Amino acid sequence: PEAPSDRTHVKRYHWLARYDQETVKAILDATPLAHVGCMMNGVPFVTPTFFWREGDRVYWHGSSAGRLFKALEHQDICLTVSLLDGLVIARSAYNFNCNFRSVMLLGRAELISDEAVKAEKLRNFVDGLIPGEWERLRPVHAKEIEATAVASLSIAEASCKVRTGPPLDDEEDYAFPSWAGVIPIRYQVLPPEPDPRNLPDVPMPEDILKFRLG
Amino acid sequence: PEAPSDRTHVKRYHWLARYDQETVKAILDATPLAHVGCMMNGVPFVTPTFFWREGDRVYWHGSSAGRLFKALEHQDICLTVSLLDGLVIARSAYNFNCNFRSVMLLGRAELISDEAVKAEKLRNFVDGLIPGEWERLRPVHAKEIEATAVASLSIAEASCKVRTGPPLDDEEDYAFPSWAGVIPIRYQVLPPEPDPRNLPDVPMPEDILKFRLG
Numbered sequence: 001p002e003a004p005s006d007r008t009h010v011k012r013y014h015w016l017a018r019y020d021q022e023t024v025k026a027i028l029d030a031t032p033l034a035h036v037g038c039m040m041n042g043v044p045f046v047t048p049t050f051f052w053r054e055g056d057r058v059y060w061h062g063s064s065a066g067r068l069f070k071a072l073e074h075q076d077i078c079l080t081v082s083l084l085d086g087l088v089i090a091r092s093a094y095n096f097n098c099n100f101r102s103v104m105l106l107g108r109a110e111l112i113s114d115e116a117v118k119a120e121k122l123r124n125f126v127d128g129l130i131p132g133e134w135e136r137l138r139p140v141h142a143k144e145i146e147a148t149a150v151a152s153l154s155i156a157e158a159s160c161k162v163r164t165g166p167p168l169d170d171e172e173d174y175a176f177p178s179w180a181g182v183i184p185i186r187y188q189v190l191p192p193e194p195d196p197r198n199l200p201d202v203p204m205p206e207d208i209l210k211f212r213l214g
Numbered sequence: 215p216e217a218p219s220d221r222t223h224v225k226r227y228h229w230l231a232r233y234d235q236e237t238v239k240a241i242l243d244a245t246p247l248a249h250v251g252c253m254m255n256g257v258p259f260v261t262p263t264f265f266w267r268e269g270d271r272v273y274w275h276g277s278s279a280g281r282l283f284k285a286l287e288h289q290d291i292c293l294t295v296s297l298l299d300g301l302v303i304a305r306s307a308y309n310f311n312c313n314f315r316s317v318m319l320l321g322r323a324e325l326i327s328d329e330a331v332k333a334e335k336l337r338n339f340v341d342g343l344i345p346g347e348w349e350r351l352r353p354v355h356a357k358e359i360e361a362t363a364v365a366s367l368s369i370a371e372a373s374c375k376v377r378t379g380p381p382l383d384d385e386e387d388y389a390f391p392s393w394a395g396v397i398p399i400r401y402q403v404l405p406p407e408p409d410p411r412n413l414p415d416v417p418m419p420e421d422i423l424k425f426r427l428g
C-alpha cells in the first residue's frame with residue numbers, strides 16, 4: 001500500500017517506508033514506549049509515555065488533570081514509536097547509519113469519558129504487560145479510575161520506516177581498507193527484584209517473567 | 215536549583231524533578247537517541263534522531279535540505295531524551311510505574327552555516343561513538359559535508375525527571391498479599407557483525423567494542 005495521506009508520505013529514504021498494517025502493528029506491539037508530540041504552552045513538547053494497542057487504536061494514560069489530555073482535544077498530534085536496533089559502521093562517515101524500526105501515528109486523539117470503558121482499557125494495559133496481573137492486585141478504587149485519563153488514537157494514519165542489514169557504501173568505496181559492519185542493539189530485561197517490603201509468604205507470579213520488550 | 219524557566223517547571227510528580235546541570239549532562243551523555251518536537255505541516259511532529267553533546271550544547275545532523283532544519287530556525291522546539299530503566303510492579307494498579315531518566319531541552323536551535331565548523335562537529339559525533347574511528351574511514355568528500363545540516367541547542371533551559379528504586383504503594387496497601395518489585399530494563403550491545411563485503415585482510419578495530427549506550 002501507498003501512504004495513507006499526503007502528510008504521512010515518506011520522502012527522505014523512501015525505500016525504507018512501510019505502510020502496511022502488519023508492519024504498523026508489529027512495531028507497535030514490540031515495545032511499550034512512545035513519544036507524543038503536542039503543542040502546549042507555545043512549544044511542540046515531546047512527552048515520553050507508555051502505550052498499548054487494541055485493534056486499530058493505541059491508548060495511553062495519565063492524570064485526568066494532566067495538561068496533555070486537555071491540549072489534545074483541539075489539535076492533531078503525532079505519536080512516535082522508535083526502536084534502535086543497531087549502529088551501522090560504513091566505509092565512509094557519510095554512510096554511517098542505524099538499524100531501526102519506527103512508526104508515526106498522526107491525527108486527532110480522544111479521551112475515554114465512560115468510566116467503565118476506561119477501567120476495561122486500563123486492565124488491558126496491565127495484562128498486556130503481565131498476563132493475569134490486574135486480577136492479583138489490591139482491588140481498584142473508584143477514585144483511582146476517576147483520577148486517570150485514557151486517550152486513544154487511530155492507527156490508520158501511520159507511516160513506518162525500517163532499516164535492517166549491513167552498511168551500504170558508495171560503489172567506489174569497496175576497495176577502501178576500512179572495516180564495516182553492524183553493532184546490534186536491543187532491550188534486555190533482567191530478573192525481577194522483589195520489593196523488600198513484600199510479605200514473606202507472598203509468591204511471585206510466574207507471569208512476571210513473561211514481560212518483554214524490544 | 216529551581217526550574218530555569220516557567221515553561222520548564224515540573225508540576226506533576228515534582229519530587230522527581232532535577233534541574234542541576236550535572237544530572238542534565240549525565241542523562242544526555244548516557245544515550246545517543248533523542249526525539250525532537252517541531253511544528254511542521256500543521257503537526258507537532260516527533261522525529262527520532264541521534265545527538266551528541268559538546269559542553270553546554272547538543273547537536274544533531276541530517277540533510278541540508280531537510281524540513282526539520284528549515285523549520286527550526288523560526289520556532290522554539292523541545293528535544294527530549296528518555297531512558298527506560300525498569301517496570302515498577304506495585305500492589306495496586308494505580309501505583310504501577312517505571313524507573314527512568316528523562317530530560318527535555320527547550321529553546322531556539324541554531325544551524326551551523328560554517329562548513330569547516332560543521333565538519334569538525336561531525337568528526338566529534340563519530341569519534342564520540344567509536345574512539346578514533348573518523349581517521350580510519352575513506353576520507354570525507356567536500357560534497358558530503360555540504361549535503362549535511364548540523365543543528366545545535368543550548369542545554370541551559372532543561373528539566374529532568376528521574377525515578378529509581380522500589381515501588382511506592384499507598385501505606386494502607388502493605389498488608390495486601392500481592393508481590394511487588396521491579397523488572398530492570400536496559401540497552402544491551404551485542405558483538406559486532408562484519409559486513410561480508412569487507413576486504414579479507416582488514417581487521418576490526420578494537421575500539422568498535424567501546425561503543426556503549428544506556
Ligand SMILES: Cc1cc2nc3c(=O)[nH]c(=O)nc-3n(C[C@H](O)[C@H](O)[C@H](O)COP(=O)(O)OP(=O)(O)OC[C@H]3O[C@@H](n4cnc5c(N)ncnc54)[C@H](O)[C@@H]3O)c2cc1C
Pocket residue numbers: 007008009010011012082083084098100101102103104159160161247261262263264265274275276277280281282
Ligand atoms: C533510531 C533512529 C535514529 C535516527 N537518527 C537520525 C539522525 O541522526 N539523523 C537524521 O537525519 N535522521 C535520523 N533518523 C531518521 C529521522 O527520524 C527522519 O526519518 C529523517 O530525519 C527524515 O525526516 P523528515 O522529517 O525530513 O522526513 P520526510 O520524509 O520529509 O517526512 C515526511 C513524512 O514521512 C514520515 N516519516 C518521516 N520520518 C519517519 C520515521 N522515522 N518513522 C516513520 N515515519 C516517518 C512522516 O509521516 C512524515 O510526515 C533516525 C530515526 C530513528 C528511528
Ligand SMILES: Cc1cc2nc3c(=O)[nH]c(=O)nc-3n(C[C@H](O)[C@H](O)[C@H](O)COP(=O)(O)OP(=O)(O)OC[C@H]3O[C@@H](n4cnc5c(N)ncnc54)[C@H](O)[C@@H]3O)c2cc1C
Pocket residue numbers: 033047048049050051060061062063066067068221222223224225226296297298312314315316317318373374375
Ligand atoms: C520512560 C517513561 C515512561 C513514562 N510513562 C508515562 C505514562 O505511561 N503515563 C504518564 O502519565 N506519564 C508517563 N511518563 C511521564 C511523562 O513523561 C510526563 O512527565 C508526565 O505525564 C507528566 O507530564 P505533564 O506534561 O502533565 O507534566 P507537567 O509537570 O505539567 O510539565 C511541566 C514541565 O515539566 C517538565 N517535564 C514534564 N515531564 C517531563 C519529563 N518526563 N522529563 C523532563 N521534564 C519533564 C517540562 O519542562 C514541562 O514543560 C513517562 C516518562 C518516561 C521517561
Ligand code: HEM
Pocket residue numbers: 050061062063064122123125126129140144145147148149226227230302307308309310311312375
Ligand atoms: C503497567 C502499568 C502502568 C505503568 C507502567 C504506569 C506508569 C505511569 C507513569 C510512568 C506515570 C507518570 C508519573 C510521573 O509523573 O513521574 C503514571 C501516571 C499516572 N498513572 Fe500510571 N501506570 C500504569 C498503570 C496505571 C493504572 C492502571 C492506573 C489507574 C488505575 C494509573 C493511573 C495513573 C495516574 C492517575 C497517573 C498520574 C499521576 C499524577 O501525576 O497524579 N496508572 N503512570
Ligand code: HEM
Pocket residue numbers: 012013016088093094095096097098161264275276277278336337339340343354358359361362363
Ligand atoms: C555515527 C554516525 C552517524 C549516524 C549514526 C548517522 C545516522 C543517520 C540516520 C539514521 C540518518 C537518516 C536516514 C534515513 O532517513 O533513514 C542520517 C541521515 C543523514 N546523514 Fe548521517 N549518520 C552519521 C554520520 C553522518 C556524517 C558524519 C555525515 C556527513 C559526513 C552524515 C550525513 C547525513 C546526511 C546528509 C543525511 C541525510 C540523508 C538524506 O536523506 O538525504 N551522517 N544519518
